[PDB]
Each structure stands twice: as C-alpha cells, then as structure tokens.
Amino acid sequence: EIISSVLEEVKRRLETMSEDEYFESVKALLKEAIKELNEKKVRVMSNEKTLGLIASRIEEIKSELGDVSIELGETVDTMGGVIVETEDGRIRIDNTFEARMERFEGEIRSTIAKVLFG
Amino acid sequence: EIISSVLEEVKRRLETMSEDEYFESVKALLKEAIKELNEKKVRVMSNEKTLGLIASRIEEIKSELGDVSIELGETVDTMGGVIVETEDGRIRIDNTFEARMERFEGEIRSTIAKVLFG
Numbered sequence: 001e002i003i004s005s006v007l008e009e010v011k012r013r014l015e016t017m018s019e020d021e022y023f024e025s026v027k028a029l030l031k032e033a034i035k036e037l038n039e040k041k042v043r044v045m046s047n048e049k050t051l052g053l054i055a056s057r058i059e060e061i062k063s064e065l066g067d068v069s070i071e072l073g074e075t076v077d078t079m080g081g082v083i084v085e086t087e088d089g090r091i092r093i094d095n096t097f098e099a100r101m102e103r104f105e106g107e108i109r110s111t112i113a114k115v116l117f118g
Numbered sequence: 119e120i121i122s123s124v125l126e127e128v129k130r131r132l133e134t135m136s137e138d139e140y141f142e143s144v145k146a147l148l149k150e151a152i153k154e155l156n157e158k159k160v161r162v163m164s165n166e167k168t169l170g171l172i173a174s175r176i177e178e179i180k181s182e183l184g185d186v187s188i189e190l191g192e193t194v195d196t197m198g199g200v201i202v203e204t205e206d207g208r209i210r211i212d213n214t215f216e217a218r219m220e221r222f223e224g225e226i227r228s229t230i231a232k233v234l235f236g
C-alpha cells in the first residue's frame with residue numbers, strides 16, 4: 001500500500017529527528033488545527049512523547065498562538081502529529097501523520113501519473 | 119528507500135494496465151524525449167513488450183508525433199517507459215519509469231514535508 005510505504009519514510013526521518021525539529025512539526029500542526037476550529041479552549045491528544053513536549057514548552061506555543069488554552073487529553077498510538085478537539089469533544093481535527101498522509105494520498109498519485117504519462 | 123517504494127506502486131499499476139493505456143504512456147514519453155532531442159531520426163530502447171508495441175503501432179505514433187523515424191535498439195531491463203537516442207548514439211534521454219521516478223523524487227519529499235511541517 002502506498003500510504004503505508006510513504007509513512008515508512010516518515011518513520012525513518014523521525015528516527016534521527018531532534019526534539020527541536022520535531023517540535024516545529026508539533027507547533028505547525030497544532031496551529032493549523034487550532035486555527036480551523038477557531039475556539040478558545042481545546043484538548044490535544046497525541047503519543048506520550050508529544051504531549052510531554054507540549055506540556056514542557058507551552059509558553060513557546062502561547063507566544064505563537066495567544067488566544068488558546070490547551071488541556072492535554074489521553075495518549076494515543078500515533079507516530080506523531082496531534083489530534084485537537086473542542087473542550088466539549090464535539091468537533092475533532094485529526095492532524096496525526098497517519099491521517100495527514102491519507103489526505104495527501106492524491107499528491108502521491110499525481111506524481112505517479114507524472115511518471116507514467118508526463 | 120522512497121524511490122523503490124513508489125516504484126512498487128507503479129509496478130502494481132502495470133500488473134493490470136491495458137495495452138491502450140500503457141501505449142498512451144509510451145507515446146507521451148517518446149514525444150517528450152523526441153521534442154528535447156529535436157532530431158528527425160532516433161533509436162529507442164526499452165523492454166521487449168514496449169519495443170514490440172512501438173513496432174506494431176508505428177503508424178499511430180507517426181499520426182500523433184509527426185514525421186519521426188524510429189529504429190528499435192537493444193532491449194533493457196526496465197519496468198517501462200523508453201530510452202531515446204540520436205541515431206549516432208551521442209545523446210540519450212532516459213525516460214524509463216525508474217529514471218523518471220528518481221527525477222520526481224523531489225515531489226514525493228515535498229508531500230512528506232507537508233505531512234510533517236504543514
């Protein structure tokens with residue numbers, strides 16, 4: 001499967017990624033989700049390492065997004081990225097790497113179409 | 119490797135591809151190479167299946183590509199696509215799927231980068 005094969009490359013890259021570079025991913029995907037939801041109180045779910053980073057570096061996050069209050073939620077089985085929901089649990093944006101790769105599957109197929117047909 | 123992985127998906131697509139669809143790939147990649155070389159006479163190398171199709175459908179090739187003169191060359195071990203050479207062998211365009219995938223590697227990495235960093 002093409003999704004799983006490209007996620008293997010994401011896995012390889014995470015193998016040597018620094019905490020600081022990974023946190024740039026966390027911040028970017030947090031901001032995207034938080035901005036689309038456009039609410040002042042959200043809950044964030046991710047793997048244990050990621051939630052720990054968000055907790056440790058909350059002030060860095062609030063400087064690039066001052067309106068939001070984050071509460072950590074339950075830890076999940078993800079390679080990385082974040083799931084962000086409203087405090088009440090009504091709306092949820094899945095910004096895990098797994099979900100994001102699925103959503104960008106069309107870009108991979110477009111490249112393959114380029115290879116085959118120009 | 120990322121190139122080998124995406125080529126596995128190309129291989130899977132070729133497992134069921136009709137002759138007519140594959141020949142659309144052949145024509146497109148021949149057209150591109152012949153345009154860049156800007157020569158009247160060329161030599162084409164590919165797997166036996168592809169060279170066979172070019173030989174049997176030469177009239178269709180000329181209808182779309184114009185007044186080209188193609189000579190079949192030796193077979194090469196490729197998944198598909200074409201290698202196109204000037205008659206004297208001086209200049210060679212590698213339009214095999216293997217070579218093309220390497221050349222479009224950047225587009226795959228851009229999709230991966232988007233998954234990670236937005």
